[PDB]
């Protein structure tokens, strides 16, 4: 049988996605977790269908930023994997 | 109508032990000797952006001396709120 | 005659005018204000559509899209410090890949 | 009912692309652009006018406004539209 | 209801940020984060919705809510 | 006999000791002052300047240095190296989101 | 030359929780600057929120949101507690 | 007339409450101003006055001074979670930063 060596499929994956706009977290498993976070400051709240749209994107654009500072975190430190202190070092130097 | 000596390589009164001296008290053990100029461009460039804000705003009131509130507004637009100049 | 009409511009001086004076940013509305405000505006319009077009054609579409409209304002570096804290909805990110990660 | 600079977008885009359209999305997406721009304009100006005691916004606190949000070629080409379209004005 | 934020998901995530490599431990870690973010935005947009005596978060209280953080979105206006 | 002479390394800390317990700006003040006007200069010709606010641009880029410093040191010791270099500074920046 | 501040009210302030303690003259200033600093943070805060409503009055509603908004946890909850006993003191 | 009684008193404040008042006014946030809020405005401005002199007076006795200096506001701020959150990004002039070495640069 044939089989790609580890990484060609990775990087074919990171053109793909780069190249493409969709989102890609599932709706419903967002919106429960959304409505369950909700849930703990105000009860019985409902929501209009293009405001999680609208968190739904600002979410996945701000771990895809984070994402990005973390690989440059990573290959910092001359290695190619992330890792835990890797996010926390870029979420200090954000400020958060 | 006596003005001073133009103005040169004034960036050398960035001295060495200066920039030594502020990494001391940011906490940095060790310093490559590549630092010194790395530190000198970046400091340059920041001080561009603040005067530019602040010589915008002192051209805005019609007045040729730049006052610490030009400052103060300069740095706060750009958020970097700076406390004990008002007033 | 409208004062858009008198000063060669396409937006709509007089709604900037109306916008400006319910929008409590001031006593008095000096009458040249809306007019450079309506100026600068178009001006940053054009300049955007241009390059959002411009990457339109380079992907043989017709039709500008929010992805050309993000890889328009990204790749311009004026834009992308004026825009550098906005995030465009379905506009994804630019293709970039660390040296470091290709084979060899 | 709802307000939007739709048209104006499309006329600029005519006039730039003629054979360029655009999708509800990107239209929705330039509408917010343009509040966006116009809100910081006229909150940076109203700075100033404070700053500075005055009760008049008038053309040239927009101009400083227009100095200090936009960086280096961009606010030179801006300030040479404004100038421009406010000389044409006059007369 | 965390779980729903699936490790592949999460590597896709990461595949647009042009990460090649990826440790087992970050999944649980990148799901603190997550959860983080959100609820200071949802408790900024909560709170619109509540001053304006409404039962029904739109999407302009979102809006003014990621604005406010200096995460200015377009498109939803 | 021998003079005496500390390790390397520990003066460093004892200086870092010494100026993180005390606030005295840490620039000569006529040389900032001198770089503040050829800067300026490039701008408008003839300006003058109020004394309380060159203090005030030297408090401000003090403080902004001094916070590089920190984050250029935490991303040092992130490489497991202690001596900061270059690169470090180019990272802290580029994740501030200043380039 | 009439510069007002907020000098004697923090000073009046500083005397009701140290009794024996002072202040120099640039920490002065800097409380100052803080003060004012806060106030056209909410001010402003509240501006927004009342044009969000499309209502033209800015009433005690709007600075309690607008607190809530600006301060973290702990201390917006404190913060809230004493401006309700406050306004509901003067009110009587 | 009746006796002049000042809405600080009525409210049991120390912030001038008039003062507040002329400033919300004339700082051209909104056409109208209810008469509670700049009430409200000042307890709140109050409240944070008394938070930070507490711990800047906590600090001045920890360094055995008597007289709170700017450093002191400094160490205040710094240490306290809410108050450095809310002014993150804030200067201090003449305050200096908090003691702080990392823990792999002491020898072992």
């Given at each position: 049988p044939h089989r790609y060596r580890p990484g060609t499929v990775a990087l074919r994956e990171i053109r793909r996605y780069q190249k493409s706009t969709e989102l890609?977290?599932?709706?419903l498993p967002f919106q429960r977790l959304v409505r369950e976070i909700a849930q703990d400051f105000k009860t019985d709240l409902r929501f209009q269908s293009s405001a999680v749209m609208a968190l739904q994107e600002a979410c996945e654009a701000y771990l895809v930023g984070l994402f990005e500072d973390t690989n440059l975190c990573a290959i910092h430190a001359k290695r190619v994997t992330i890792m835990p202190k890797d996010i926390q070092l870029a979420r200090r130097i954000r400020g958060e | 109508k006596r003005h001073r000596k133009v103005l040169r390589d004034?960036?050398?009164?960035?001295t060495k032990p200066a920039i030594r001296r502020l990494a001391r008290r940011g906490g940095v053990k060790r310093i490559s000797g590549l630092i010194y100029e790395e530190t000198r461009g970046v400091l340059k460039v920041f001080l561009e952006n603040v005067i530019r804000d602040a010589v915008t705003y002192t051209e805005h009131a019609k007045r040729k001396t730049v006052t610490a509130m030009d400052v103060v507004y300069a740095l706060k637009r750009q958020g970097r709120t700076l406390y004990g100049f008002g007033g | 005659k409208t004062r858009s009409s008198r000063a060669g511009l396409q937006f709509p001086v007089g709604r900037v005018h109306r916008l400006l004076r319910k929008?409590?940013?001031?006593?008095r509305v000096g009458a040249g204000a809306p007019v450079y405000l309506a100026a600068v505006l178009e001006y940053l319009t054009a300049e955007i559509l241009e390059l959002a077009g411009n990457a339109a054609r380079d992907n043989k579409k017709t039709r500008i899209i929010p992805r050309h409209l993000q890889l328009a304002i990204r790749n311009d570096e004026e834009l992308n410090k004026l825009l550098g804290r906005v995030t465009i909805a379905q506009g994804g990110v630019l293709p970039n890949i660390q040296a470091v990660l290709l084979p060899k | 009912r709802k307000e939007s600079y739709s048209i104006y977008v499309y006329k600029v885009l005519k006039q730039v692309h003629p054979d360029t359209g655009i999708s509800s999305k990107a239209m929705g997406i330039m509408n917010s652009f343009v509040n966006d721009i116009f809100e910081r304009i006229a909150g940076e100006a109203s700075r100033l006018a404070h700053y500075n005691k005055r009760s008049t916004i008038t053309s040239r606190e927009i101009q400083t406004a227009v100095r200090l949000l936009l960086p280096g070629e961009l606010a030179k080409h801006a300030v040479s539209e404004g100038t421009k379209a406010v000389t044409k004005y006059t007369s």
């Open positions: 890609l977290i599932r709706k | 004034n960036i050398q009164g960035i | 929008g409590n940013y001031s006593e | -």
